Amino acid sequence: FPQLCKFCDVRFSTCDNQKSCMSNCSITSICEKPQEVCVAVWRKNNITLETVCHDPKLPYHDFILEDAASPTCIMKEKKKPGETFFMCSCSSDECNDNIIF
Amino acid sequence: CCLRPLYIDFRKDLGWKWIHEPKGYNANFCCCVSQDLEPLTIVYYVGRKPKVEQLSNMIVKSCKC
């Protein structure tokens, strides 16, 4: 059965130094494949937060989702060069509304 | 056995998280059984695609005893 994990794409965020910030996204989606999974990425130059629904076999941003089955999203640095880069992945339904660091 | 007014707020009562808008609607509740129903137009997303569709049997109208 397909998940709902938020698909609000790239957005400018007030997320900063707090342990956990909420996706202020207005749309909850019915993921296009039952296999899929949400991810939330929070790249820090200003800061953009990205929330989509994704597939655990496919790589995102040339990275691969190893904790894709975890029930609540958790961000770890992926050390993309030149930027602060964080990513996570859900197995729950609209996981990536609350990001935990 | 006369019609009645009730309000329902998808996320906070039915528990449906997939509906984008509306947040709720007024369906009515009728013992007296519901006679006539009608559909509710709603909006929701499959991935990022937004789509429109009527959900039939959402709004009650006539009551029959």
Residue that the structure tokens 């938020």 belong to: A6
Give the resolution to one decimal, in Å. Answer: 2.9
Residue that the structure tokens 């709603």 belong to: B42
**Structure-determination technique:** electron diffraction
Q: Tell me which residue range forms the domain holding B15.
A: 1-65
Whose CA is closest to B35, among B59, B2, B64?
Answer: B64
How many domains are contained in chain B? 1
Which residues in B lie closer than 8 A to residue A7 (C-beta atoms)?
Answer: 45, 47-48
Partners of A77 in the β-ladder: A86
| Residue ranges with strand state E in B1-65 | 33-34, 37-45, 50-60, 63-64
User: Among the CATH numbers 3.40.50.1820, 2.10.60.10, 3.30.830.10, 1.10.3720.10, which is that of A1-101?
Assistant: 2.10.60.10
Whose CA is closest to A28, among A56, A55, A8, A48?
Answer: A8
User: CB distance A4–B18 less than 8 Å?
Assistant: yes
For residue B21, what is the nearest residue in chain A, using CA coordinates? Answer: A27
Distance, CA of B50 to CA of B7 (rounded, Å):
25
The encoded tokens of residue A46 equal 């200003």
CA Rg, chain A, in Å? 12
Within 8 A by CB and 6+ apart from A66, the residues are none
Q: What are phi and psi of B27, to 5 degrees?
A: -105, -30
For chain A, give the residues followed by a break (C–N over 2.5 Å). 45
